[PDB]
Symmetry: C3
Subunit: 257 residues, 3 copies
Amino acid sequence: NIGMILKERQDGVLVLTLNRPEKLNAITGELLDALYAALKEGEEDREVRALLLTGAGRAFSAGQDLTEFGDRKPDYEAHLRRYNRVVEALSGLEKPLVVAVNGVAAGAGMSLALWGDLRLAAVGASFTTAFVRIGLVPDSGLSFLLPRLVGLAKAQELLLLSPRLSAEEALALGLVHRVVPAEKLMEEALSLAKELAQGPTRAYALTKKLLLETYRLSLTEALALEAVLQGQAGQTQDHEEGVRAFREKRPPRFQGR
Amino acid sequence: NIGMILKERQDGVLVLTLNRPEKLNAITGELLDALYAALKEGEEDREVRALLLTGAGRAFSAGQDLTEFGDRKPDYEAHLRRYNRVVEALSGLEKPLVVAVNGVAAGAGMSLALWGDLRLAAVGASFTTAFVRIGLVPDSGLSFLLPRLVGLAKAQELLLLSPRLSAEEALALGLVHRVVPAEKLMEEALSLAKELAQGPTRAYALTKKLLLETYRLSLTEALALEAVLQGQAGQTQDHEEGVRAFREKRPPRFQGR
Amino acid sequence: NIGMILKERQDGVLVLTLNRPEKLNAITGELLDALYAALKEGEEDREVRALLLTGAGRAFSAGQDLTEFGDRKPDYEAHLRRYNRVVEALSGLEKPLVVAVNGVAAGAGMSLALWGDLRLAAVGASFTTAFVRIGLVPDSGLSFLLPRLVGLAKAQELLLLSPRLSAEEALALGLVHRVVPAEKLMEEALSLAKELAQGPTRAYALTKKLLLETYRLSLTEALALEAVLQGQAGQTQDHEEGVRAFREKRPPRFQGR
Ligand SMILES: CC(C)(COP(=O)(O)OP(=O)(O)OC[C@H]1O[C@@H](n2cnc3c(N)ncnc32)[C@H](O)[C@@H]1OP(=O)(O)O)[C@@H](O)C(=O)NCCC(=O)NCCSC(=O)C/C=C/CC(=O)O
Ligand SMILES: CC(C)(COP(=O)(O)OP(=O)(O)OC[C@H]1O[C@@H](n2cnc3c(N)ncnc32)[C@H](O)[C@@H]1OP(=O)(O)O)[C@@H](O)C(=O)NCCC(=O)NCCSC(=O)C/C=C/CC(=O)O
Ligand SMILES: CC(C)(COP(=O)(O)OP(=O)(O)OC[C@H]1O[C@@H](n2cnc3c(N)ncnc32)[C@H](O)[C@@H]1OP(=O)(O)O)[C@@H](O)C(=O)NCCC(=O)NCCSC(=O)C/C=C/CC(=O)O
C-alpha cells in the first residue's frame, strides 16, 4: 500500500500496521510520513479513544532501510528532523497507544515499539538496539526511553554490545509488559486497546505528559505541573463520572472528556 | 483526635499515625494541616532523630476522601497547593523517615507511603495508584517518585491500569524494602527507626537532598552539589566521630551534628 | 610505584591497575592525579581503543584513605575539586572502559568501579557505599550514578544503611554485568576489552555522551542531541564500513574514525 501503513478502525481503536513485510518493515522517510499522517488522523478522529501499532509479516521492524541512502555523504542531523516529528507525535499522543511486537524490532524499529504506553510481545519476537553494529548512536528517542525503561546498567549493555533479546528476556527487563503466543498476540493486544478505548482518555493523555517530563523537573516543578494538569483533569466530565461511580460502587462509563 | 494525626515519642523516634480508621485514613485538608504540623514539630524537636509514619486500623490510607468535595466545580490546581506543602515538607525532611504500610495505600495514600526513606509493609498490605479510576492524574509527587522508584515501564502499567499490588509484588518492584507479618510490622519498623535515630542525622539529611536533585542535574552540577554538601557533612562533629571510630575499629556514637 | 597506578598496553587495550594493595588501594590525591594522567594518556594514544581498570591484591579500592587528612578542619568542598576532574575524565572518556572488580569496592572505590561502561566482578568481590558510616554523603559521582544504575528504591537502602553486597547481589541490582570466578576475572575482562577495542570507538564515545545527558533533557532536547551526534557518527569511516558490512552480510572492520 502507498505509504506502507495499513489503517483499520474497530470499537474505538485505530489499528496501524507497518506494511513492508518483504523488507521486515524497514523504515523509510515515506513510511515515517505515512505513520505521522495516521497518528494525526487517529488523534483527530473523535470515534478513536486508543491506538494499536503492530507489524505485517515476520518482523515488527528491522529499523532504518540500509538501502534508502545511496553511498552519498549522509546528513543524519538533517534527516532525523523527520524521525523526529514522528517521535514528537508518538510522545505527545493524547490517546493511549498499545504496541504488539509480532517479531524482531531492531534499531529505530525497537525505538518505535518502546513508545507504546502498554507493550505486548509474541513468543518468538526479539529486540536488538542494532545502531552500534552500523557505527551509529541510538536515535528516534531510544537514548531517552531505554535508560528510563530498563535503568542505566541494562541500557549500557544493550546499546554498547547490541545483544539480541528474546521476548521473555524483554519481559524481565521491562521492554514489554506481557508475552503471549504468536497466534494470540493480536487478540490480546486488541482486547487491551478496546479496554483503554473505554477509559478516561483525558487522564491517560495528561498522565503521559507527567511521565515524559518527570526526570528533568525539580520536585517543586513536578508538584506545580501535577497541580496544573490535575486542575484540567478535575474539570472533565470523566472526573465527575469517576466520583459518581465510586460513591455508588459501580463501574465508571468514561467518554474521554 | 482533632486533626486525625496521633503523635508519640520513643527513644529518638517521633511515631505519626494517620487516624481516621473508620474512613480507611482517607485524606482531608484538615488531616494534611495536622500532618504538616507534626512533621514540623518532629524536625524542630532536638530529642527526635527519626520519624515513623503508619496508619490506624485496616488501611494505611485510601487517599483523598471522595466525600470532602461537595458536587461543586472542583479547583484541584488551588487545593493541591496544600497536598503540595505537605509533600514539600516530606521531601525536604532533615531527619530519616520510616514508613510502615499496615494495609492498603491508594492514590495520595500510596504517594505518602512512597515518601518514606525506608519502607516496610505488612503481609496483606496492598498498593494501588487509584487516580486513573476517578479520571485523575497521579498527584502528591506520585508522578515524580514512581518512575524513579520502579522505572518507567512499571510506572506506566501501575498508573494507566491501576492494578492492586500485594506486599510481595511491591517488594519485587521496590515500592517497599521489607515485608513482615502484620503482628510484627510496628516492632520491626520501630526497631529500624530507633537504629536510624542513633545514625548520622546530618549525613542522612544531605544524602536525601542529593537523591531528590540527582535526575535533573548534569554530571558537572551533581559533582558541584556533592562538593558543597560534603563540605557541610565534613564540618559536623559526627564526621570527626566517624573517622575516630574507623581508626579505632569501634562503633561510631553519632549525635546528629 | 610512584603515583600507585600501573599501566600496561595489550592489543588495543590500556590496562590500569590501582596499586596500593597494602592499604586496599585506598585513594589519595596523589593516586587521583596518577589516574587522571593515565586516563589522559589512554585517550590520547591512537594505539588504544579501550581501557580496563582493576585493583592490585585483595581489594578493588576501600575508597578515601582515612589516614591522608590529619585531624585538621577538613575542607571537602575544596578537595573534591580533585576527585571531581578524575570523575569528569571518566564520565567523558571517548573510549569504552571495562571495570574488573577483583575485591571490595567501598566509598569512592565503589564510585570509581561504577564509572565502567561494562563491569565484571570476581566471585568473592563486594560493594559497600561506606560514606554514611563516616558521617559523609556519597561523592565522586555516586549520588549521580547509583539511582540511575539500580533505581531510587535500591539507592536509598544502599546509601542510608551501607550494607555489604556480594558479587551475586551486585549482579542482581545492575552494579555489575557479569560475575566470574576470581582466577578467570582478568582473562574475561581483557577478552571483553579487546572485543570493544575492535569496535566503533566513535559510536561508543557519542553513545556514552547521550547516556550521561539523558535524564536532565526534555524529549525535544534529547531528539536534537541525537540528531547532532548521529550527524557526527554518520560522517565517520566506521559508519560507511558498518553499512558495507551489513549489505555484504560480513563482520565490520572498525578503525575508530
Ligand atoms: C535482526 C535482523 C533485523 C533480522 O535478522 P533475520 O530475521 O535473520 O533477517 P536477515 O538478517 O537474514 O535479513 C533478511 C533480509 O532483510 C534485509 N534486512 C534486514 N534488516 C534490514 C534493514 N534494516 N535494511 C534493509 N534490509 C534489511 C536483509 O538485508 C535480508 O535481505 P535479502 O533477503 O538478503 O535480500 C537483521 O536483519 C539485522 O540486524 N538487520 C539490521 C538492523 C539494523 O541495523 N537496523 C538499522 C539500525 S540504524 C536505524 O534504525 C536508524 C538510523 C538513522 C540514521 C539514518 O540512517 O538515517
Ligand atoms: C482499595 C480501596 C482503598 C479499599 O478497598 P476495600 O478495603 O475493599 O474497601 P471498600 O472499597 O469496600 O471501602 C470500604 C469503605 O471506605 C470507603 N472508602 C474507601 N476509599 C475511600 C475514599 N478514598 N474516600 C471516601 N471513602 C473511601 C468506601 O466508600 C466504603 O464506605 P462504606 O463503608 O461503604 O460507607 C478502595 O476503597 C478504593 O479503591 N477506594 C478509592 C481509592 C481512591 O480512588 N482514592 C483517591 C484517589 S484521588 C487522590 O488520592 C488525590 C486527589 C486530589 C485531587 C483532589 O481530589 O483534591
Ligand atoms: C569494607 C572494608 C573496605 C574492607 O574490610 P576488610 O577487608 O575486612 O578489611 P579491614 O577493615 O579489616 O581493614 C584492613 C586494613 O585496611 C585498612 N583500611 C581499610 N579501608 C581503609 C581506608 N579507607 N582508609 C585507610 N585504611 C583502610 C584498615 O584500617 C586495616 O588496616 P590495619 O591492617 O588495621 O592497619 C573496610 O575496611 C571498610 O569499611 N573500610 C572503610 C571504607 C570507607 O569508609 N571508605 C571511605 C568512604 S569516604 C570516601 O571514599 C570519599 C571521601 C571524600 C571526602 C574526603 O574525605 O576527602
